[PDB]
Amino acid sequence: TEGRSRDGGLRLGEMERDCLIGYGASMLLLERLMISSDAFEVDVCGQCG
Amino acid sequence: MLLFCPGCGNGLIVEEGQRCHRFSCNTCPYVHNITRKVTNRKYPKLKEVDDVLGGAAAWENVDSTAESCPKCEHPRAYFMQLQTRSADEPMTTFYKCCNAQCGHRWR
Amino acid sequence: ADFDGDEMNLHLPQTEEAKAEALVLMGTKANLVTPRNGEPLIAAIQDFLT
Amino acid sequence: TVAVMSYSGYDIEDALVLNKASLDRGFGRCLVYKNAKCTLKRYTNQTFDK
Amino acid sequence: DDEEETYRLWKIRKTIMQLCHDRGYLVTQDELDQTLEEFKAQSGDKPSEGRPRRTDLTVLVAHNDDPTDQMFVFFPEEPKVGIKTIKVYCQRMQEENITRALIVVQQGMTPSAKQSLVDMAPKYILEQFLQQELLINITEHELVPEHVVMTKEEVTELLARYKLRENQLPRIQAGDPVARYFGIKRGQVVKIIRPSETAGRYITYRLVQ
Amino acid sequence: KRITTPYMTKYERARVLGTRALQIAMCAPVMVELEGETDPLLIAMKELKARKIPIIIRRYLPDGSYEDWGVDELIITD
Amino acid sequence: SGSMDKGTLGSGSKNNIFYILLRDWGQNEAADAMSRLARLAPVYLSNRGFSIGIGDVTPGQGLLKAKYELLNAGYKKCDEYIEALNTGKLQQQPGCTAE
Amino acid sequence: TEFFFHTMAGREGLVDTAVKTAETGYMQRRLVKSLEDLCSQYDLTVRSSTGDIIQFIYGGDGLDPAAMEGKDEPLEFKRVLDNIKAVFPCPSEPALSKNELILTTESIMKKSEFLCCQDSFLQEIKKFIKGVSEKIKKTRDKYGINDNGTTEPRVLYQLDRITPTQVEKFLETCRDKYMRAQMEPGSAVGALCAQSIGE
Amino acid sequence: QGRFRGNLSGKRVDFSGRTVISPDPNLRIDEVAVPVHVAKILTFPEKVNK
RNA sequence: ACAGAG
DNA sequence: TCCAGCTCCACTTAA
DNA sequence: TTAAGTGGAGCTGGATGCTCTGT
Ligand SMILES: [Zn+2]
Ligand SMILES: [Zn+2]
């Protein structure tokens, strides 16, 4: 969620993503934006896509 | 030149008749035969300037001389000062230095 | 930063690989020079120069 | 009472050092008043909060 | 005038001499250094000089390849060259059995003739140069590094050193003026020798596409 | 033969220490003698200094071929 | 020899001594020396004492006589240029109008 | 009136600071979105994501802007040679003459390990060594120094003193600083370009 | 505020904090002082091994 | 939707 | 509030 | 005489910085 009233959590914005690319940090950019925000799994049919 | 009909006061046009060219109204019968030479001179503005520039004296009619640059220390100089960025709480300067024609331009 | 009511953010990485990519690549001891023109940024400041 | 000097190195960029025995005696003591309100309405149905 | 008009017919002729010397056509050494005062000798000013058909170049043969590989250079006289003058040059070129020709237009070309120069023949390839582009050799300009058209046996060694294909190289267009200077078609690779700030040199490559 | 660089880059160093720390975090055997260390990254850096990490870095060229370099034969540096 | 300026200890540019330690003796020797400087310089400076005052910006008697003469000479030459523009010829600099 | 004019000149700085933020951030967003794909491969080329070549060697030199000890150049030979003369004074070795310096320089530079360097760097090393040797000859012509080592005021061998150990350490340090100054493969070089132009 | 900029390329994360900053020169150049009120909330999942 | 802060 | 594509309309060449 | 290819003019649709802190 958003703010301090709602126990929000901070934002890796568009610009801070651009700094982590410049270091070449691949797994840290994976951990921040997938593992510790909204990780999920889906069932995908490989035939019909 | 604008010329206007004594009758109705519309604008006259020049046309050609059977004996003379005429000023003629478009809305009334009035015509005026051009019997003699009539003229209208514009007298436009000529290109008055020639404009050579870039002389060294035209460059160094600014205050600074005999100061010190951090690059080549020469006396003949051309300085500049700015302040128009208040994110920069420090001052802003830029310097030109051309005694030995070294030509630095730094902060 | 200028310490006049300044807010900075923090992030604790949650993986061992997220640690080691942050320590080797992104540490302060490995980022003393700026990548723009190679000049040092982490150096002394006022009252350490005076 | 302000002395203008360079002291202890925690005062580099706009930070300022205070006196511990001045804050104890009442300097800088503030109060923060907040609010918490609650309404108890009657409905169109003849029922009410309680 | 006539000090500045014969200047153009001298400078354009000199630049066409250099353009033919860089494409591997046989140019003698004196034509590359034909002095203005010496150009006054074989043609004087405009009352004695004649513009359109006196300054043609058909001596140019590919001394690398073959003496029958020949190329015209024509100077049309009217400013906007219509289809009829192109047909005149094409039937002359048909008569002499030459395959390549240049046309130096003075002000431009009518848009139905620019369409003509593409679709008349794939065996009859003709290049439009304005006379204002030929007033300076663009290879001599200091912003233009030296281009070298590469052989197939050098393209093959280029693509084997980096393990590439043709379509992964950087590109140059065929409408590029320096591409039209060398007369290069789709599928050739040029070598660009870039000068550095030091005495070093960085080599790079472009595909025509 | 192998034509690529003999110096270990910072990215190879970072990912080798990361994958080795994730292996030491699970109950993998340790190739060096630890002396009271609990952070797995510190044990990974002790294994890196002593040239004992069992990782082979495979370097993919953009055409598709590769080169198998050992960790114990790249020149490590700061 | 020589004191330590901004261009030798500070964050400006090269010829920094910490940049010399970074390029010659590793990362860790440039990082320890900055911690030693951060530790050592306030201990000297807060026991030397270093302060500013209104007497540190007050103009002396040498300035107040110079400033008056400079203002008088400058305002007189500007007034002469005003009179030379409005009431006759001005030596027009190249590229610009008389104003 | 002077206060009002100085306030006029100050509000321009404030408003340029305030307008500067939206003036620049969209430009940096465009630069980053256009340059984020480029990478330095292991075959010393810079390619996009699709496989096309942007540069055959990065920057012409193959080197890293973060590792330049000089003005856009990997070393500065005067400072390196002075560093080696100060860290390793070899007090029990003879000072080399001009021709002995050129001889030992061309002797070391033909080993196996120097072949990995680019040719322009080796040419700049040989040019610098020739300059140093000409300084040695210009000194030893003035002070009457004989190269055999037997002139009696022995302080004269402190003037342009250079030993073979210092020359060996010099060449090894220059070569090691050149080989570590190369752009390492995998570097997100387009993102560094975008940030270093947008900042 | 769409999906691509607002929720995909950049998104809100947890294990993160935000506080006012203040100087401290008795630390090194590669250290940072985390308050204890934030050090109890932020956690790192350490796996149990030997 | 408005005000702040850096 | 500023700026590339798309479409409409006179303006020559060419038959 | 007119078929047609290409200039110039008007219309249309797109875009305009990063976060927290409260009502
Ligand atoms: Zn009338
Ligand atoms: Zn200068």
Angstrom distance (rounded) from CA E124 to CA E122: 5
Does residue A37 sit at the C interface (CB-CB below 8 Å)?
no
Measured CA to CA, the distance from residue B65 to residue B97 in angstroms comes to 9
Residues in contact with H42: Cβ distance below 8 Å, sequence separation at least 6, in sequence order = F4, F5, F59, F60, F61, F62, F67, H185
Question: What is the total count of domains within chain E?
Answer: 2
Cross-strand pairs, E130? E105
In angstroms, rounded to a whole number, what is the distance separating the alpha carbons of residues H16 and H31?
22
The amino acid present at A16, given as its one-letter code, is: E
Interchain CB distance below 8 Å, H83 and G14: no
Is the same domain home to E21 and E77? yes
- Encoded tokens for I50: 């030997």
The domain boundary, picked from E102, E136, E170, lies at E136
User: Is B15 within 8 Å of B30 (Cβ atoms)?
Assistant: no
Asked whether residue E2 falls in the same domain as residue E63, the answer is yes
Pair (E153, E101) in one structural domain: no
E interface with F, Cβ–Cβ < 8 A, is 163-164
Give the minimum alpha-carbon distance from F10 to chain A in angstroms, rounded to a whole number: 10
- Helix-then-strand count for chain D, H and E: 1, 0
Do D12 and C2 lie within an 8 Å CB cutoff?
no
HSE at residue D48, side-chain half, CA atoms within 13 A, is: 5
CA distance F18 to chain C (A): 4
Q: How far is residue I43's CA from residue F46's CA, in Å, rounded to a whole number?
A: 25
Kindly state whether G12 is in contact with chain C, defined as any CB-CB distance less than 8 angstroms: yes
Q: Are both E74 and E174 inside the same structural domain? A: no
Q: Which long-range contacts (CB under 8 A, 24 or more apart) does E142-145 make?
A: E144/E178, E145/E192, E145/E193, E145/E194, E145/E195
Residues E144 and E59 in one domain: no
Expressed as residue numbers, the domain containing F75 is 1-78
- Give the minimum alpha-carbon distance from C14 to chain H in angstroms, rounded to a whole number: 24
SS3 of chain G? CCCCCHHHHECCCCCCHHHHHHHHHCHHHHHHHHHHHHHHHHHHHHHHCCCCCHHHCCCCHHHHHHHHHHHHHHHHHHHHHHHHHHCCCCCCCCCCCCC
Cα(B79) to ligand 2 centroid in Å equals 10
8-state DSSP, E105: E
Q: What single DSSP character describes residue F71?
A: G
Q: Which residue is listed with tokens 């923090």?
A: C10
Residues whose CB is less than 8 angstroms from the CB of residue E82 and which lie 6 or more positions away in sequence, other chains included? E110, E112, E113
Q: DSSP of A1-49, one letter per residue?
A: --SGGGT---EE-HHHHHHHHHTT-SHHHHIIIIITT--------TTT-
Separation CA F63–CA E165 (nearest Å): 10
Across the interface, whether the CB atoms of I29 and C11 are under 8 A apart is answered no
Domain final position from E90, E119, E136? E136
DSSP string, H55-124: ESSTTTT-B-GGG-SSSSSS--HHHHHHHHHHH---TTSPPP-HHHHHHHHHHHTTSSGGGGS-HHHHHH
Same domain, E84 and E143: no
Using CA atoms, how far apart are residues E194 and E177, in angstroms rounded to an integer?
A: 18
Contact G98, G92 (CB under 8 A): yes
Resolution in A: 3.1
| CA B21, chain centre distance (Å) | 41
Any strand L atom closer than 7 Å to E112 CB: yes
Instruction: Find chains touching chain E: ≥3 CB pairs under 8 Å.
Output: F, H
- The continuous run of DSSP H or E covering E108 comes out as strand E108-109
Domain boundary among E89, E120, E136: E136
Q: Which domain holds residue E146?
A: 137-209
User: CA(E128)–C1'(L5) in Å?
Assistant: 19
Residue with the two structure tokens 């440039």? G30
Closest by alpha carbon to G36, among I29, I31, C32?
I29
Angle between helix H189-198 and helix H2-35 axes, rounded to 10 deg: 170
Question: For residue B107, which ligand has an atom nearest its CA?
Answer: 2
- Cα→Cα distances H33→A17, C36, H45, H55, H190, Å: 11, 19, 21, 19, 10
Q: Quote the distance between the C-alpha of residue E63 and its chain's center.
A: 16
Q: Is the Cβ pair G51, D4 closer than 8 Å?
A: yes
Task: Give me the phi and psi of B26, to 5 degrees please.
Answer: -90, -15
- Quick check: helix, strand or coil at residue D2? coil
| Environment class of F24 (CB within 10 Å of its CB; exposed 0-12, middle 13-18, buried 19+) | buried
Total number of domains constituting chain F: 1
CATH code reported for the domain at B56-106: 2.20.25.10
